[model samples]
Target: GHMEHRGTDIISLSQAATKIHQAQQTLQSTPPISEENNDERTLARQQLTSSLNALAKSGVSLSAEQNENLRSAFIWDMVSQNISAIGDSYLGVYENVVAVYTDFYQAFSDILSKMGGWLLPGKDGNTVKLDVTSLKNDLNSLVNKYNQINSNTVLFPAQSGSGVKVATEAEARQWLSELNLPNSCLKSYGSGYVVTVDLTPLQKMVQDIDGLGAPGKDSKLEMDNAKYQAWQSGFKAQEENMKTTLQTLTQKYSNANSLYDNLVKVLSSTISSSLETAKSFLQ
Candidate 1:
């Protein structure tokens, strides 16, 4: 059971993190019951902790919308880092430039096919990772093959008879767009590092965790206003079924998220940090 992948074009990391943070904010409302007492609160915490722990081990799957958001982040983060490691040349020749671009494309598609820890980060003590071995090795050998004299560069073979209209950042972007990679506002990736991804929103999704209470209802769409029921159940009386109490919704949102601070730091840390360790294997 080894091997897998989203291209970096799916969505920006900032967007992903932003939506995740929004969800975190929405889920944090509906405080626990006022009369529930500390012991019940402790029980609430324990119940949610184990479930969060289960999630940390088994991992939580994302919705199609959520999946694509994060999938793009992982790809963006990896591709940018890999391109950075290669260093940038303002006027890269089309041939070798295409060579680098080609492998990143290869890496891009390869990453696209994956289904793993990176998808639902913080689960299974996993970190975001992309296999840039081909990118790294190709870059390594490309330099070696040309007997590149520069300390940093591995010169690529030129067409025996080529014009001087070298590929500039703009041209590189043309290749990027044709390749279907969505570039950031800055220069194209081939030119240098343009950080357009941010996993912080996702981090805060975990960082600003809390438990949910009852009398909830009405999602942030907030349309038709408070017409919807709480996270669940009829609080304080009436006829209900599932033995749902003040703690039910609290268990759902608040408790698990509260411990997400401690329990899923692996998830958040991996996203916000560990870019280098994830890349080390390729080196």
Candidate 2:
């Protein structure tokens, strides 16, 4: 079987890394039991290496600082790096411009460094500066870089979950609608290097907008304030919305992901319940 067939969202490798970090953090808060967390600690260490290896293989190199920071086997480090890669890929697009336009390609020796290693970075590793480039020139380079990336992107697209492979705009839209995602949701997916979608916050925003009913305008509204209550309220609102949205979408996106379904559902309920308890003024 092909490795990509797992259809694993290559993206989730970092997310899983995040959970590993959280487990370590939580363990730190508790008195050390006799190796109850040893297996997890070990697995966390191994996954970090695997993720690092995978990243290096993908033509992306990490700074020594980045490597050293990840020395701890925490889930946060994993998630951070995973998120970092996604972001770095986005940021690194600009570097490609220098390569394609001005011939900043990496040398053969550098490419060879990655032979038993990661993929070769595009021409000259595009290390040269592209100062004062015109918008028209930049736009041309953008298109050029985009085309090269499509042809050279080292990543295997993630194809797991209940979703089918969508090859065209029409097909992708039809598939999203089948999942009950609104047409408006489709429009918001702006064109970008990475196909980005984080529905937890969006879903919650829609819900909050749906539930809005002028609770604060009434003079009867009153509640005991806590430290940072005003700022916390805004955060609490966004967090609740994000939690709800994540719960709803994950469950809807794939019924098979029971772990997220259960996890987010529990989290959504917990947050909602606490919000309710704090809602003595709502009634």
Candidate 3:
């Protein structure tokens, strides 16, 4: 019956460590500041804390080094700090870069509204219609709720003014060719971590701790020390992994503001040129 209890503890610790490892893998796979990665990191922290408390309740005595190791494994403190930084980066991108793309569309539409409408000649002896009203409406719709929708879902309004309406994808491509708008003006404003530890020695130490809790083994106090040692080992490994992951994500979160600003400049200059040229020709 006593052995059954020890076996149960071993299984519990094993399960916890396995979960911690799996969580790390999830964190690695998700992109920085992504909801999925945030969830995985949260899961990792919970597992680490649960393991620490449960092991402590089992009264596992441990060496100072082992205790340090186990404490490090949960990495809640490290993750908390890193999570805050990543959140700030995400917000910064959203406010400054992502939001500005919508602003550019609005500005471009306003310029188009200012310019008197002109008909561009199309192939097949038809003139292309510039449905400025529909185009502006699409732009307004996007601007009114850019953040409400997914960035990838953002569809740039097709130039569908008159005659040869750029309704189809092929028509849109042909329109782009006629207008000579650079594709570079449409870069989608869009945007992992890793960890490690040797678990073999730790697993063996845990087994040793279990053996000491045997009837033929030392006092219960000594067994408690062994259990504590196992806990510490697990904790330390988790801590190291978490810290490493944070560092990696931090490196990937570079500032994109300048690049985005340049894009705005390029778009404005190109659109303004087109508007002025069209207005002069119409006049």
lDDT against the true structure, per candidate, is 0.30, 0.33, 0.36
lDDT of 3 by residue, 61-166 (tens): 3346433543443133343344334333332322222223334334434634643442222333432323334333444443344323233222222112332211
lDDT of 1 by residue, 1-283 (tens): 2321122212222233343344334324423222122223334334433333333333223346533644443333342343222222211222232333334334333533442322222213333222223323333443333222221221121122332222455554554443233343123223332212112222222222112212113211211212222311222121131123212322433433453333223333333332223233442
Error of 3 at 103 (Å): 18
Rank candidates, TM-score, best first.
3, 2, 1
How high a TM-score does candidate 3 get?
A: 0.29
In terms of lDDT, model 2 sits at 0.33
- Between 2 and 3, whose lDDT is larger? 3
Q: Who is ahead in TM-score, 2 or 3?
A: 3
TM-scores, in order shown? 0.17, 0.22, 0.29
Q: Across residues 109-210, which tens digit of lDDT does each residue of candidate 2 receive?
A: 232243232212222433211111121233334334433323121111222234322234564454345334334333222232221122333234334332
Residue 213, candidate 2: Cα error in Å is 25
lDDT, ranked from best to worst: 3, 2, 1
Q: Where's the lowest-lDDT run of ten residues in candidate 1?
A: 218-227
